Each structure stands twice: as structure tokens, then as C-alpha cells.
């Protein structure tokens, strides 16, 4: 379509021509439309072919989580509360303007539970959701029992060397090793059918309760509602001294309330899992946004019958390839504990599933392919056990970072063994580091369980907020989570986590969509979908992002580390990804090959690529295991493009002429309120970043047919910006030239900003020419003005004459485009702006042309141009020329 869809608010989509202007009544209440209530709310846009996808959800939502029985989640359906989300494709039905009518409604029903299922939901806890306002030292949580108290006791490190041997953990150096963290203190930790709290701690190694939920109810939520209160007024507002208070930033990322109380986690799950779209030729695949975790997405088939539940496909069902086997082992292995012959000892380990929750980035598809990307959100076990057991209310995490001496290769150095079964980092001192070597047999790891303990002990499954597995407050973690553990004697290098910060792609066939579609609809127990075109990647926080980190040497821990994160976010050591988005690169290939495309996500401090073999449809490979998969890169950002607050994400878009991600940024996208619960002043304006391919691509001749270098991305914070505006709108017209729909009060103004060598700068002239319009829908034509349609000059019909043209006929000056050329001269209002001439006979003797000029997007528009069928009666000249022989 030769327009563009801009979403007005939560429920109205307004069709707009290249001239940023609105076609007349094209705007539409698609929520209405969907016959959907008001409570309803667009979550998400696509076209598809021709059709218009769009993605509800509603603010009445209302999950409940029940144990017992076995259809354990299902929706509250007293009151208003059965208000599942939907997906919905409309078509246009109009020749001229714009009609949309609604073609096909597709229900997103509730996960089932297997029985075995249900038996890792009962004691399922999650962590709050990170916010805008976490700190560092508000996730930090306290240390939990070292690698030797949990295994021998009361009985110090002198009994280790010798009894290491008869726990399985022989040569192991580390009997100070964490086994995790405390769940007493800190973020609040919660089951699916209790709800977070509006408070976070700002020591979350002193100021919260963790997964106490009891605690926190009596004693300490008084604390926290008296120190940091609601704004309401009259003012009120108190010290802040112990906990943040961040109810409106939790509305704003999509949690969920009655009055001043979040609904329920299981709530707040559903209502994030149903963000994203993306469409192929058979499906409809939707996935949670980037602030949640989400534990499932639905695999819709666009064959379904109407009033069918379209079910989704957990991914604890979604087995994927982390790259290497020992990769996808490092993540189960601490997801909780093993052969748990127990009794209620039941967590995602325990019960034979994988991974259970990504931070989604988004999804998106190109010819019939699904791509994804995200962070593995962390989860680990914990000890649930109430009685001693040394463990009880702790985690169970320890750092999985590679061992120094290690071969330098990244398949070495991703498939060491370090960590795999459980701890073995912590500080080492001969030239101080945290992570030493890897007589009569090898280094051994094991689950900080003591065979005592065996069947006695209760192991339960957590989720984290964000990509860390290890909360604990001691110097390992702070490394992992910035990439800091470097090697020695070779040109250096990085030693990856396998846990914590890891970033996932891949790409997913249409027979890949069709198992999860049957996981999801399974009878009785779970069945199971393996995804074979993925991959993982260690993706931590820029280390720049912080101050003040102690090395050569008292360590700098989480509830020390200082943040001077500039991306919007309070803290330095979650990552973060948003707008993935896919495109087919223009350029084309060799004649035997099928056309190339990538797609690109935002994280913390970079950009990153995906790159794909197409034409067997797969992630790029190269052969040699030890340079890095090469269907991943990673582009740091500068200074200003750190700059932006990636929490203002409003849209991404590709354009195919150009090979161009726009990424757009709302500022009106802010919380209300701080977490002081002072109000937000900078919630005006926006940014947009624009993403191009770098680097050798794919097949462009015989010597690319292999790559042994990855292809990669450059983000650039493109010049198009405003603190002082309210967007509605930016419309890429082409690579020299976007067009800015916004406000300065109730106006709606349109800017046309100009690319420079790469630099977009404001032109007023051309902003003030494309906006005087009159009241039509495009620029107006005047005939003495360089506006934006340049300016025409005519010769006079003297010309004829002069020439000798006037021996020549009608038609045959209509026949020599060269010629009509010459009866005018033109002056372009931007460097290759073209125009040529229309010819029209109107007698034997007589002609008459009329201009036919290209706009800023590209395309040449003349007397007959239309946009969605509606003619632009853009007021062209027209001249007549006479004199011409009828020979
Ligand atoms: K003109």
C-alpha cells in the first residue's frame, strides 16, 4: 500500500499519505471493529499481504492459579475478568479511502497443565519485575551457605581436603564457593497466585523480604507504605530512606491493579505474554514483551475454526539448541536438583523440562520464517524445606564462568566444564582473579545437596526479573554481569558465563510452528518441540555503564557497585533487548542464490545482528569451531546513542528501498512518577535511531559463498529528535528524508527533516513548503515558488518556430521524449529531484504537457496521482503548445 498505518492511541488506526497527511476517514476504532469492549487495548501491528493483524489485550484481564483439580490456570469469570486476549486480521474493503472490515477473530486461551506440570507450579516463585528505577543495590541479594557448610558443617576447611573425595568433589579448590542466595531478604519473590508489592528495597541485602510473603504482610510492609507513600492530596510525600515505591512505573511497563494492589503474578504473566505478533502464510505467532518474562507463546494456525481456544506451547516444553550440548546442560543442570527421589522435591529439573522463561525482544517473520530473540530469564532452584538443612530459603546459583587455562576458542572455552554440575568460582589469590586451572584425576563439580540431605530435602523452582541466574552479593557476580573475567598470555580474551546474561535467536520453520502447535494441544502429559535453528550467546552489560570498579585488589560487589547507566535504566548489570525486527537486504546477490536477510534487536549499549543463510533457511555458519557462531554480532553504541532511554521504545520499522531499521522512541512513554514519587519532567519529545548493515554479505560473488566473519550492524542516533514535541508520528520516506507528524500544543505540525552525509538536520523551507497544503493532502503548486514540487518554467511558443519543430507533427513531438524535455526548464528544490513532462494532443495542430515530478519518497506524482484510490489534485500546470503541421 502506498501509505502508512500510524496508531493515534490505544484503540485508533489513521492511514497517512507520503505528504503526512491523514486520508479522510480512514481513521478507524479497530477495537470496536474487533467487537471488543473498552477495556481492550491494541497491543500490536503487522500487515501481512494485504491484511491489517492486530494483537488485543485488555485491562479487565483476570487469571486465577489454582493447585488443586488439574485445569489449574484459568480466567476469573465472575464479575468483568474473562476477557482473553485476541489476534485479529482485517482487510480493506474500499477501492477509495480506506474500510476496514474484519475477517478473522482468533481467541488466545490459557496454557494446560500436565499433572507434571502442576507439580513445579505449586511451588513456583518469581521474582518482581525489574523497573526503571532498580538499583544495582536493590537486586543485590545476601551470600548463602559456602560449598563446605552445606556438605560437612559445623567442621571448618581443614576436614575439606580430605573429605571432598566421599561428597563427589575431588580436587575441587573452592569450598568458599556460594551455593546461592538468601530469599529472606530482597526483591520480593512470589507464587502465581499472589501478587508483587508496589515497593522495592534499596538494599536488598538488608531491606526486604524476599520470598517471605508472611514477613512481608505483618511486620515489613508497614515499613515500607510508611517510608515511602503513594503521592496521595495535598501533597503529603515522605523520606525514601528504605524502599523505592514504584507503582507508576509498574503501570507503565503493563502490571496490572485494583486500585492500589497488582493482581496476581499469574495475571501480570498472561497479560505481558500477549504482546508481540508476527505473521507467516499459516500462522499467528504471539510472544511476551521485554519487561516480563513470559513462561509460554501461542502458535496460532490461521486454518482455525472460528470460535476455536488456540492454546499456547510453554517453553519448558521448548527444547532449543543453546549451540553446543554442554551449553544447554550448564542451564538445566541449575534449574534445580536431581534424582530428587524425595518426596515433594518437584522443579523444572526434577521433572525433565528445560529453560522456562526469555525476556522476549520481539518476533517477526520473513517468507513463511519465524525469528525470535531474547534473554534466558534466570531460574535456579531453591531449598523450600521448613524443618535443620543449612540451605533452607536459599537459592541455589553459583557462577558458571569459564577457568583461565583454557584452550582460547569458542567452542574451548564454551564447552569447559567449570561449573556444570555446581559451584566453583569465588576469589583465588595468586595475582588475585576469580577463576584458577581446569595428580590422579580430574577437577569434579557437584549440586550443593548433601547426600544426607538426599530425600530428606525439598528443591523448588524460581524465575528471576531479569538475565541473571546468581544474585549473590560477593565480587564473582558483578564480573559475570559485566563481562570483566578476562585470561591471560594470549592476546587476552573474555571468558564467558553460561548462565548468567544469555542472550537467544533463532529461526523457526513452519514444521517447527506445527510440533509446538501440538505440545500445546497435547492430551495428558507433555510433549516436547525441538527448535533446531537457534543459538545463545553470553551478552552482558557494558562494563562502561559503571564507576569505581576495585581490580588488582574488599571487592566491589552489587549493593556497591556504582551505576552511570545513561539508557533510562537505574541499574548497571541487567541486560535489556527490544525491537527485533527482520528485514530482506535490497542488494541483491549472485543469479544462482536466493535474496539475503538479517534482522536486528536493541540491547544495553549496542546493537545486535542476526544473520541467516537463506535459501536452506538456517543461522550462517562457518566451519572452524573456534572463531565464534558468525550468525551473531554486536555493535557497541557511542555516546549518543547510549544516550537514548530504551525504556521509550515505541516502534520499529523496516524499509525494504532503503535496507533501513528505524527504531522510534517516545518520551510520553515515562512513568508519571519517580520512584521518590516526585513527578517526571522529561516525559517530552522523542529520538529515533536508525540501523544499517555493515561488513562483507553473503554470495555477492564466487569468494562469498563462505564467510569466516560474522556480518554485522552500526546503530546511529540519525539527528531526528526533540525534547519539547509530542510525536504522532515518523514516516520514512526514503533515505535522504523523513517526514515528523507531531505537536507543540493541539496542532498537528509536520517537519521534514533532511539527511546530510548521514546527519538528519530540520529543513524549514522544505518543512514550510510540504505543510502548506491548503487543506488537501498534498503540498500545493506554485507556479513562481521553488516549492516542493520544485519550479517548472515553460518556454514560450516561439519555440516552434525558432527550432524548425514546427515541421514537425503532433504526434511525432508526442513520440521524442527529448524533445518534450526542452519546453521547459526545471529547478530542483532537492539534489535529483526529477521531473518530466506528460504530453496530450488536443488537436492536429496543438499539444499540451503538464509536469510529472518526483516528491521526496521517490515516486513521481502528476494531474491523475491517487493514494489508496483517492485522487491528490495536486494543482499541476498544464500548457498548450500550437503551430505543429498536420503533414
Ligand atoms: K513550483
Known amino acids: 500500500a502506498n501509505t502508512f498505518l ?34 481492550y487495548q491494541i497491543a500490536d501491528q503487522t500487515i501481512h499481504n494485504t491484511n491489517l493483524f492486530v494483537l488485543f489485550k485488555s485491562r479487565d484481564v483476570k487469571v486465577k492459579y489454582e493447585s488443586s483439580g488439574s485445569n489449574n490456570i484459568s480466567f476469573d469469570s465472575t ?18 479511502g480506506i474500510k476496514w472490515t474484519m475477517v478473522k477473530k482468533y481467541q488466545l486461551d490459557v496454557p494446560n497443565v500436565s499433572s507434571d506440570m502442576n507439580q513445579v507450579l505449586k511451588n513456583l516463585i518469581l521474582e518482581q519485575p525489574l523497573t526503571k528505577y532498580t538499583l544495582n543495590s536493590s537486586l543485590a541479594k545476601e551470600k548463602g551457605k559456602t560449598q563446605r557448610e552445606v556438605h560437612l558443617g559445623s567442621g571448618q576447611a581443614n576436614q575439606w581436603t580430605s573429605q571432598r573425595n566421599q561428597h563427589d568433589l575431588n580436587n575441587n579448590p573452592s569450598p568458599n564457593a556460594s551455593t546461592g542466595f538468601k530469599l529472606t531478604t530482597g526483591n520480593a519473590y512470589r507464587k502465581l ?65 485494583d486500585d492500589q494492589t497488582p493482581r496476581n503474578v499469574i495475571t501480570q504473566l498472561y497479560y505481558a505474554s500477549t504482546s508481540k505478533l508476527a505473521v507467516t502464510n499459516n500462522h499467528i505467532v504471539v510472544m511476551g514483551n521485554s519487561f516480563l518474562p513470559s513462561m509460554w507463546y501461542w502458535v496460532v494456525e490461521r486454518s482455525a475454526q472460528e470460535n476455536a481456544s488456540n492454546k499456547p506451547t510453554w517453553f519448558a516444553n521448548t527444547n532449543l539448541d543453546w549451540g553446543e550440548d554442554k551449553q544447554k546442560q550448564f542451564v538445566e543442570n541449575q534449574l534445580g536438583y536431581k534424582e530428587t527421589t524425595s518426596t515433594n522435591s518437584h522443579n523444572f529439573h526434577s521433572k525433565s523440562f528445560t529453560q522456562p522463561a526469555y525476556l522476549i525482544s520481539g518476533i517477526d517473520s520473513v517468507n513463511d520464517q519465524i525469528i525470535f530473540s531474547g534473554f534466558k530469564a534466570g531460574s535456579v532452584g531453591y531449598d523450600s524445606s521448613s524443618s535443620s538443612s543449612s540451605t533452607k530459603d536459599q537459592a541455589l546459583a553459583w557462577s558458571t564462568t569459564t577457568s583461565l587455562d583454557s584452550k582460547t576458542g569458542y567452542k574451548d572455552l564454551v564447552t569447559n566444564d567449570t561449573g556444570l554440575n555446581g559451584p566453583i568460582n ?33 528443591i523448588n523452582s524460581l524465575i528471576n526479573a531479569t538475565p541473571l541466574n546468581s544474585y549473590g552479593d560477593e565480587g564473582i557476580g558483578v564480573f559475570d554481569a559485566l563481562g570483566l573475567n578476562y585470561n591471560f598470555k594470549s592476546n587476552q580474551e573474555r571468558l564467558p558465563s553460561r548462565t548468567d546474561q544469555i542472550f537467544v535467536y533463532g529461526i523457526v520453520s513452519p514444521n517447527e510452528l506445527r510440533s509446538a502447535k501440538s505440545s500445546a494441544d497435547s492430551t495428558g502429559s507433555d510433549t516436547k518441540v525441538n527448535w533446531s535453528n537457534t543459538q545463545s550467546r553470553y551478552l552482558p552489560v557494558p562494563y562502561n555503564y559503571s564507576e569505581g570498579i576495585i581490580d588488582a585488589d574488599s571487592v566491589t560487589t552489587f549493593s556497591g557497585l556504582k551505576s552511570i547507566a545513561p539508557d533510562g535504566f537505574a541499574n548497571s548489570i541487567a541486560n535489556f533487548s527490544v525491537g527485533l525486527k527482520a528485514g530482506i537486504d535490497p542488494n541483491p546477490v549472485m543469479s544462482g542464490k536466493k535474496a539475503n536477510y538479517g534482522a536486528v534487536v536493541l540491547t544495553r549499549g549496542g546493537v545486535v545482528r542476526l544473520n541467516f543463510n537463506p535459501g536452506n533457511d538456517s543461522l550462517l555458519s562457518t566451519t572452524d569451531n573456534n572463531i565464534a557462531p558468525i550468525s551473531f554480532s554486536f555493535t557497541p553504541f557511542t555516546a549518543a546513542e547510549s544516550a537514548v532511554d530504551l525504556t521509550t521504545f515505541k516502534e520499529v520499522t523496516y524499509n525494504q528501498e532503503s535496507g533501513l531499521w528505524s527504531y522510534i522512541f517516545d518520551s510520553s512513554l515515562k512513568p508519571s512518577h519517580d520512584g521518590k514519587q516526585t513527578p517526571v519532567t522529561d516525559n517530552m519529545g522523542f529520538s529515533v535511531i536508525t540501523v544499517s548493515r555493515t561488513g562483507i554479505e553473503l554470495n555477492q560473488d564466487q569468494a562469498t559463498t563462505t564467510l569466516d566473519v560474522a556480518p554485522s550492524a552500526l546503530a546511529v542516533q540519525s539527528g531526528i529528535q526533540s525534547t519539547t514535541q509530542t510525536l504522532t508520528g515518523v514516516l520514512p520516506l526514503s533515505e535522504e528524508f523523513s517526514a515528523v507528524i507531531a505537536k507543540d500544543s493541539d496542532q498537528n505540525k509536520i517537519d521534514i527533516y533532511k539527511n546530510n552525509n548521514g546527519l538528519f538536520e530540520i529543513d524549514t523551507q522544505l518543512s514550510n513548503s510540504v505543510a502548506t497544503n491548503n487543506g488537501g493532502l498534498a503540498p500545493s503548486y506554485t507556479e513562481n515558488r521553488v516549492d516542493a514540487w520544485g519550479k517548472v518554467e515553460f518556454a514560450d511558443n516561439s519555440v516552434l518556430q525558432a527550432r524548425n519543430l514546427v515541421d514537425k507533427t503532433v504526434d511525432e513531438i508526442i513520440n521524442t521524449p527529448e524533445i518534450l524535455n526542452s519546453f521547459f526548464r526545471f529547478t530542483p528544490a532537492f539534489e535529483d529531484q526529477k521531473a518530466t513532462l506528460v504530453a496530450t494532443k488536443q488537436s492536429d495542430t496543438s499539444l499540451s504537457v503538464s509536469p510529472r515530478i518526483q516528491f521526496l519518497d521517490g515516486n513521481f506524482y502528476d494531474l491523475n496521482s491517487t493514494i489508496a484510490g483517492v485522487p491528490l489534485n495536486i494543482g499541476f500546470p498544464s500548457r498548450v503548445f500550437a503551430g505543429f503541421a498536420a503533414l
Not at 15 to 39: C, E, G, H, N, R
Not at 79 to 96: A, D, L, M, R, W
Not at 235 to 251: D, P, R
Open 6 to 39: 500510524v496508531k493515534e492511541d490505544s484503540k485508533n488506526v489513521t492511514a497517512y499519505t507520503p505528504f503526512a497527511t491523514p486520508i479522510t476517514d480512514s481513521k478507524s476504532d479497530l477495537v470496536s471493529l474487533a467487537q471488543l469492549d473498552s477495556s
Open 79 to 96: 464479575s468483568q475478568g474473562e476477557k482473553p486476549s485476541y489476534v485479529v486480521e482485517f482487510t480493506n474493503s474500499t477501492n477509495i
Open 193 to 257: 497466585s499472589e501478587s508483587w508489592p508496589i515497593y522495592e528495597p534499596i538494599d536488598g541485602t538488608k531491606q526486604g523480604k524476599g520470598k517471605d510473603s508472611s514477613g512481608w504482610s505483618s511486620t515489613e510492609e508497614n515499613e515500607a507504605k510508611n517510608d515511602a507513600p503513594s503521592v496521595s492530596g495535598g501533597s503529603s510525600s515522605g523520606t525514601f530512606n528504605k524502599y523505592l515505591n514504584t507503582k507508576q512505573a509498574l503501570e507503565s511497563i503493563g502490571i496490572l491493579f
Open 426 to 458: 569465588g576469589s583465588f589469590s595468586i595475582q588475585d582473579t576469580f577463576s584458577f586451572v581446569v595428580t590422579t584425576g580430574p577437577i569434579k563439580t557437584a549440586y550443593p545437596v548433601k547426600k544426607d540431605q538426599k530425600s530428606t530435602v525439598k
